[PDB]
Design a protein around this ligand. Sequence first.
Ligand SMILES: Nc1cc(CO)cc2ncn([C@@H]3O[C@H](COS(=O)(=O)NC(=O)[C@@H](N)CO)[C@@H](O)[C@H]3O)c12
Ligand SMILES: Nc1cc(CO)cc2ncn([C@@H]3O[C@H](COS(=O)(=O)NC(=O)[C@@H](N)CO)[C@@H](O)[C@H]3O)c12
Ligand SMILES: [Ca+2]
Ligand SMILES: [Ca+2]
Ligand SMILES: [Ca+2]
Ligand SMILES: [Ca+2]
Ligand SMILES: [Ca+2]
Ligand SMILES: [Ca+2]
Lengths: 421, 421
Amino acid sequence: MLDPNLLRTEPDAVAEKLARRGFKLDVDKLRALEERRKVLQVQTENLQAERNSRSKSIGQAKADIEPLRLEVNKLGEQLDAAKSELETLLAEIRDIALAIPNIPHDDVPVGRDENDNVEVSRWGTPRQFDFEVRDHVTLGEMHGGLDFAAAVKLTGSRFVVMKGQLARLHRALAQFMLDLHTEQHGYSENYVPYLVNQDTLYGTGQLPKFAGDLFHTRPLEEEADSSNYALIPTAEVPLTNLVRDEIIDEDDLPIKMTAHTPCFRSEDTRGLIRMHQFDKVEMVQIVRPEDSMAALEEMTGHAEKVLQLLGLPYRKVALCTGDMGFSACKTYDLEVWVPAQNTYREISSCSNVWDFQARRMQARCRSKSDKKTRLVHTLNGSGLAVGRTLVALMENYQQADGRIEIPEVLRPYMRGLEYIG
Amino acid sequence: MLDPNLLRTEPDAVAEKLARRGFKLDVDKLRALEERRKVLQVQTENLQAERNSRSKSIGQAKADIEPLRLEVNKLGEQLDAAKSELETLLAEIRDIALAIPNIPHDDVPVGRDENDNVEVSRWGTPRQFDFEVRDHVTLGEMHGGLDFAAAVKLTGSRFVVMKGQLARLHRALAQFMLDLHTEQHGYSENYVPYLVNQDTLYGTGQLPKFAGDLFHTRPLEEEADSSNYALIPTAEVPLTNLVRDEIIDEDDLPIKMTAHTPCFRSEDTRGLIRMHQFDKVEMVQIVRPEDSMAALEEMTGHAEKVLQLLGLPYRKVALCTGDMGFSACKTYDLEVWVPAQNTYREISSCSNVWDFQARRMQARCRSKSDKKTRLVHTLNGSGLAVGRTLVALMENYQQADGRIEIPEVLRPYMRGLEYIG
Ligand SMILES: Nc1cc(CO)cc2ncn([C@@H]3O[C@H](COS(=O)(=O)NC(=O)[C@@H](N)CO)[C@@H](O)[C@H]3O)c12
Ligand SMILES: Nc1cc(CO)cc2ncn([C@@H]3O[C@H](COS(=O)(=O)NC(=O)[C@@H](N)CO)[C@@H](O)[C@H]3O)c12
Ligand SMILES: [Ca+2]
Ligand SMILES: [Ca+2]
Ligand SMILES: [Ca+2]
Ligand SMILES: [Ca+2]
Ligand SMILES: [Ca+2]
Ligand SMILES: [Ca+2]
């Protein structure tokens, strides 16, 4: 959600920044709705006041209360009708306001799509192979460890069954990532629900605009009016909502949280690349408004550190205005080298959300003296998407016979094992 | 599913065994449906034969084919009508057959409910405390590590948010359990889908009878006719279905599999005890029919070994006929000591399923020479339910000030940490 006072004072200036994302803000409709809202708001508050006054006259006349009671009931019917008409108009304003993406920060390069993204840095040298590179699907078949056919039998397309040592390696990657962020990077570990409610989804921006990208669960028989849930598309959703409706003491900031969860989306026909269910170790930071740009560089470095310790070459890319996600104001993507595809592929997206989710959640901070609160800033970043790390690990460390060399940093997580196979 | 030939030859003998569970088999309705099925089956196969013959006469007359074509279309309409009437009757037989629980093995003590279960063994001595025992909810509040209120905000009742060292300890328990079963007990690790289809749910017995105990997801826009999924209530569902429609070489048996998954059910108002989402390390065995009773003792010992290495006192209980789950033919429950409740509480259920799920899945085995296949037997057991292990660990190892002593066997999983707090 953008600042409603910013939409009322500078609508054309806001529409200009949003045009860089390719978003056309309907300024004309927002103005006509807002002018009609002020007319209905005055009419409604006048009815609220006269009804309140007419009912006080009843208690004052108790010292015939029937002619006064009829008037109070007509005023009550008129007030409810005016309140419903007003609420219908407020919901139309909300339908527009809650579908507006975040305003891009000035640091973001202007661009129309992913071909306009700017490479910021590169690390490591892609391996030169002495044989024909096999992809992760072929490697998983050779080991009997990645089985897409069994997952189609159990469920359907875009799911996987991992078996044996490759399932073990996938678990080891998550253990290493969680240990790195909690032991070296200052994040606190969290176990979160994988089903969340509508308030949580509105809070992080998935609702109202991206309902179709979620798996929704039908309400339960015994919780019929309070169980309209959806599976989490990322741990960013439950983690960021932990500060919803909170006033945090600024001394307690930053709040740095991590979690390893499955992620569920219904948004590459072959492999672990774009599945409906995938594991991801997520990093979330809740910070003071002035520290969010520095916290973005810090969190991006925490994700880069995972790729560096694993020996996986990668590139850091600043997303342009046209390639950013809905709630981000600034994003860096990390793209890992994938030898069978001869290119870098996205493995992490690190964003500064500014106060866009804090506005929806009412997440604020305050100094003990300060007579006023302030919205916090929120940030989220993959550190990393675990299945994509397994793809990169398998392809970059494959041997001529298909054996997988286990990166040195993961060997304590595999009981010192050097190779799978 | 029970053997259909056993329901046709010994219906009263089957009804007698099922009566021990408190299940009344409607023998009279099954017989009347089966007699009417034989009438419709003869009438249908006679129509299939005459239609097949009448269409062959068309090709033979190509050497006027209009009087013969009209007859073929009337026969075709009569055959389709007879096939639909027959299929409606087959579905009524299926509605009865697929709701019948498994026949209890003779080893199972006869009983009406859980108060008739038989204690088989006991291990360890419940700790005598020098202070008033705190429950896991109070301990989690003192540490700030178990937060039920935050989970109600994110989702609703019967969910939890774990934070900091207690989330870390919960992860350490799962790591230890998976490492024990894969390193010492011969199980192969699996990563499975957490959403499964209707065939999978019918295969393990959740459908048709227990649909109301599952979270169901609405079909996806782009997969409208192939995405009616449900969240897994246990890893037994995807793991056991890995052998659906397979003929396994008997030399490859036993197939021993383990997985750590969240579990989702909508079946203790306070705590981690009965939540809609809980983690569990599951053990599944697919074995030859003659080895299933020995494999049950082996798998129960693998679950008991977890409690023993963790130093948690427990009791092993043989469930009576009236307290067994739907698909089990024989079950042992392990009940861990819970000091705040002054009793043992269920933490594992280990079952021999016999051929009941193998019948539904068509999972069979064969020796290379053997001219005929045989249904395998399946088994499943908790090793263990992770949140209940955390409950027992917290309460049994709490110190007077609320600190949690980390069991010796988990300390390598916590970087040598001795106490939380
Ligand atoms: N996003 C993606 C989509 C799909 C479609 O179901 C399959 C994937 N399997 C792996 N990912 C990986 O998930 C990462 C994070 O996703 S993101 O939407 O860009 N960003 C977030 O969710 C933020 N909370 C920061 O992590 C991406 O960088 C991608 O590599 C997939
Ligand atoms: N079952 C249970 C139900 C609920 C209600 O949502 C919450 C729970 N939180 C922990 N469990 C634990 O899950 C264990 C296994 O569940 S079972 O249905 O008995 N058996 C199976 O699922 C087999 N596949 C063997 O594991 C039980 O022993 C119980 O301690 C819960
Ligand atoms: Ca501080
Ligand atoms: Ca974001
Ligand atoms: Ca992106
Ligand atoms: Ca063998
Ligand atoms: Ca069972
Ligand atoms: Ca039970």
